[PDB]
Amino acid sequence: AKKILVTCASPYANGSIHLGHMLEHIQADVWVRYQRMRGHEVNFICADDAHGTPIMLKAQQLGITPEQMIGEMSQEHQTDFAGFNISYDNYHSTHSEENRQLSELIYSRLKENGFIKNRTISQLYDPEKGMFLPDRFVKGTCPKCKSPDQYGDNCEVCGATYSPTELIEPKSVVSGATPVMRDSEHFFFDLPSFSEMLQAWTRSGALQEQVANKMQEWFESGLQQWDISRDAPYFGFEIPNAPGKYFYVWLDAPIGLMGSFKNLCDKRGDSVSFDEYWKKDSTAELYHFIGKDIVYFLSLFWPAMLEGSNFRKPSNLFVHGYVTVNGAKMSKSRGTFIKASTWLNHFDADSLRYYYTAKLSSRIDDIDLNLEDFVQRVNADIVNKVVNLASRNAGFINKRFDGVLASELADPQLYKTFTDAAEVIGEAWESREFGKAVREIMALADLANRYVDEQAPWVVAKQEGRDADLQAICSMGINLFRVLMTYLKPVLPKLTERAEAFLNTELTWDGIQQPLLGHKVNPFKALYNRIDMRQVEALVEASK
Numbered sequence: 001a002k003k004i005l006v007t008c009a010s011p012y013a014n015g016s017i018h019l020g021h022m023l024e025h026i027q028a029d030v031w032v033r034y035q036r037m038r039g040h041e042v043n044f045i046c047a048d049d050a051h052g053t054p055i056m057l058k059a060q061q062l063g064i065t066p067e068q069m070i071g072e073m074s075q076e077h078q079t080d081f082a083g084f085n086i087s088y089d090n091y092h093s094t095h096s097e098e099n100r101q102l103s104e105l106i107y108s109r110l111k112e113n114g115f116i117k118n119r120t121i122s123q124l125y126d127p128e129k130g131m132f133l134p135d136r137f138v139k140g141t142c143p144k145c146k147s148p149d150q151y152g153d154n155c156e157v158c159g160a161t162y163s164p165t166e167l168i169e170p171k172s173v174v175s176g177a178t179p180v181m182r183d184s185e186h187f188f189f190d191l192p193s194f195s196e197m198l199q200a201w202t203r204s205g206a207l208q209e210q211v212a213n214k215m216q217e218w219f220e221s222g223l224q225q226w227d228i229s230r231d232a233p234y235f236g237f238e239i240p241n242a243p244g245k246y247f248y249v250w251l252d253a254p255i256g257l258m259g260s261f262k263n264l265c266d267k268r269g270d271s272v273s274f275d276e277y278w279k280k281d282s283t284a285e286l287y288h289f290i291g292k293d294i295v296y297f298l299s300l301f302w303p304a305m306l307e308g309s310n311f312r313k314p315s316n317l318f319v320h321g322y323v324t325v326n327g328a329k330m331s332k333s334r335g336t337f338i339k340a341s342t343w344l345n346h347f348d349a350d351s352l353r354y355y356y357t358a359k360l361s362s363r364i365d366d367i368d369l370n371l372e373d374f375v376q377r378v379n380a381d382i383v384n385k386v387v388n389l390a391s392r393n394a395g396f397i398n399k400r401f402d403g404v405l406a407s408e409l410a411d412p413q414l415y416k417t418f419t420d421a422a423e424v425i426g427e428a429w430e431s432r433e434f435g436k437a438v439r440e441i442m443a444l445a446d447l448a449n450r451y452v453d454e455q456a457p458w459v460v461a462k463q464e465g466r467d468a469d470l471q472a473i474c475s476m477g478i479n480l481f482r483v484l485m486t487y488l489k490p491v492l493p494k495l496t497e498r499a500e501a502f503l504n505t506e507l508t509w510d511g512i513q514q515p516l517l518g519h520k521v522n523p524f525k526a527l528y529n530r531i532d533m534r535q536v537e538a539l540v541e542a543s544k
């Protein structure tokens, strides 16, 4: 009955999707699929973050228009997300008419409300190329150790940090020309004006404890005005009434989420939902699944921008940690920096979805993809605990009972134990305590396989006149499988489809209250196969 709008962070258009991105999109998708299972109106949307100096320069280097380049990466990104079954209702772009109009609208409202200031700053400028240089586009000699060819604000030899203006014999990364300091008028967003409102939100109890604690650090350091303009040449939106000035990519980026929803509503011919979800009096819920590296933007700048332009603010922010492989940050040399596209050449999407889900929680701690454990866990839990309930019982039903399940539950009490667990498991999905949900589900799977072993169908099957017993036992196992797959439906979309084909029924959350009795099931190849370390080693090799 609830109206919910969910988004993830918008991936940058100048890079491919990797396992880090996938943790976020998978976490959000599991939550979204669960919400849909409970009957809510859900809108899951995203967009590619396509503006900025890096993108402009990359396109120039490739000899193509930025429009062509971002279009190609958008398609690549969407192919990867589709491959992992991320159920987006809309995937748009920050480079769109919807975002242009909303960005100009919000800026105009902020300016009229007195939240935009003008001030001149001094910045390194490449006079040959004719453009201001962001820090990482300046290279030179470290002022401390004198090591050559260091980029930006830090030295990778001695570890010193400094303003690029301190680099000795500075060179433009773009042209090789010597940059010089040049003045430029910039527009600033008055974030400090929203300090009290933001502090009140921080102590409201909605945000994760770890996020609130971090925000207190930011309030202690002191909020500052935010430089939201960038000079031409740039790839982005030009600021109204300010020739040669553009909105900094980070200003239009989150607005692009609003733009994606407007685009969805417009394509649907829906003229009422946009305002119903974004106006101040909205009763709809808005959630953003994001990584800790962008919390400053989504928890401080974003709510302030919305407040200042008369729009509703996020109902909550769901923050996740970094993704490590084998305990450490992804390493290109070790072949642990894995692309989403590469992953799918070696494993299915469900395997990673399951592993991440089993490790996820409501906290912002990092999630480790230990490859050896990945093989062990997928084989133990998916193949040997859950799918085993179907694979060890389906054969007898199809071969000796014409595919028809028993007319009654052999063990109603045990079945009730399984359905009684729905409340706690659903609450775990709801609260994002994914690891807890998986543990509960697997504990039930253990009870199910214990039941089958207690009944010993491999013994019953060879004994005279025990056909009724065999059908009863195997049917019971299949019904337990039906329940477990329902609880896991948000996690394993593809295996779920195969399970539904086998069971001849769509799995619904409430449906488990009615077991399958005197019901025809279909034969199947193999619902899920084992994986091994040889496959893992091949994945790593292919990633080097």
Ligand code: MET
Binding pocket: 008, 009, 010, 011, 012, 049, 253, 254, 255, 294
């Ligand atoms: C509106 S969220 C933008 C996120 C940004 N593109 C990043 O990857 O960090």
Ligand SMILES: [Zn+2]
Binding pocket: 142, 143, 144, 145, 146, 147, 155, 156, 157, 158, 159, 160
């Ligand atoms: Zn140095």
